[PDB]
Design a protein around this ligand. Structure first.
Ligand code: HEM
Length: 247
């Protein structure tokens, strides 16, 4: 990574937008949606072709219409008046900043943030985000092969589901992973380990972590050691927020 220089005015806008985003996301109870927005923005990166990734394209109707993005229109429209207060910021940075803030305000680790991503004109093709009905090979095709993230990243990042819930009108899955879906903690992993449970969701892709010999040791470590989860989580979210950026 070689991070670009931005003006002092750009930096001031980042700092002030970070603060506004905290109060906004906290009062609106939308941290999970905003984290999902940031992931769906970044996760389309394909290292092979250098296409996709966290470049502001998620606001384009063409990208909002991807079925994986059901409901992200709401996230995008919720942020528009606040974004209008910071016209200097790229959409790319703004949506990644909303992701970082979503983790922080729910009590998660502080993910280092570097400004300067440029807004690209071209949304990636649909079909690159993970499929919750699939298993380990698939997650490795999505996170490893396309994104260029590690197996440690895959498991730590699945920890993002520690906040939030699925919606039957969005993915078709329904419910929270955790009893405290607005609190950033290691509950995702402890829930996974205690198996199926009334009124908590587990996806087939979550189950795939429990039977992989590389993913399972990590699920165990995060279930047992929240600090270790926070540190690996922060590292993985940083890498994710920076795919294709500043290489
Ligand atoms: C590992 C592959 C992944 C799969 C298969 C997956 C799948 C899903 C699905 C199906 C939903 C439900 C959407 C809905 O119906 O509202 C969801 C929600 C969510 N995902 Fe993921 N996801 C993955 C990775 C990630 C990552 C890496 C993050 C970011 C750290 C993330 C953050 C979230 C959040 C915050 C929600 C909750 C949204 C809300 O409460 O409205 N996910 N995910």
């Amino acid at each position: 990574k070689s991070y670009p220089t931005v003006s002092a005015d750009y930096q001031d806008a980042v700092e002030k937008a970070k603060k506004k985003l905290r109060g906004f996301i906290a009062e609106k109870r939308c941290a999970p949606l905003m984290l999902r927005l940031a992931f769906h923005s970044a996760g389309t990166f394909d290292k092979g072709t250098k296409t996709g990734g966290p470049f502001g394209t998620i606001k384009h109707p063409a990208e909002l219409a991807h079925s994986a993005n059901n409901g992200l229109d709401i996230a995008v429209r919720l942020l528009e008046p606040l974004k209008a207060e910071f016209p200097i910021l790229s959409y790319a940075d703004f949506y990644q900043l909303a992701g970082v803030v979503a983790v922080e305000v729910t009590g998660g680790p502080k993910v280092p943030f570097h400004p300067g991503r440029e807004d690209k004109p071209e949304p990636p093709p649909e079909g690159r985000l993970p499929d919750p009905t699939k298993g380990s090979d698939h997650l490795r095709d999505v996170f490893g092969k396309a994104m260029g993230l590690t197996d440690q990243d895959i498991v730590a990042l699945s920890g993002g589901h520690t906040i939030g819930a699925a919606h039957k009108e969005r993915s078709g899955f329904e419910g929270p992973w955790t009893s405290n879906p607005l609190i950033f903690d290691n509950s995702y992993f402890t829930e996974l380990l205690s198996g199926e449970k009334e009124g908590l969701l587990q996806l087939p892709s979550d189950k795939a972590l429990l039977s992989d010999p590389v993913f399972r040791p990590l699920v165990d470590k995060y279930a047992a050691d929240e600090d270790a989860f926070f540190a690996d989580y922060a590292e993985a979210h940083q890498k994710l927020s920076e795919l294709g950026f500043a290489d």
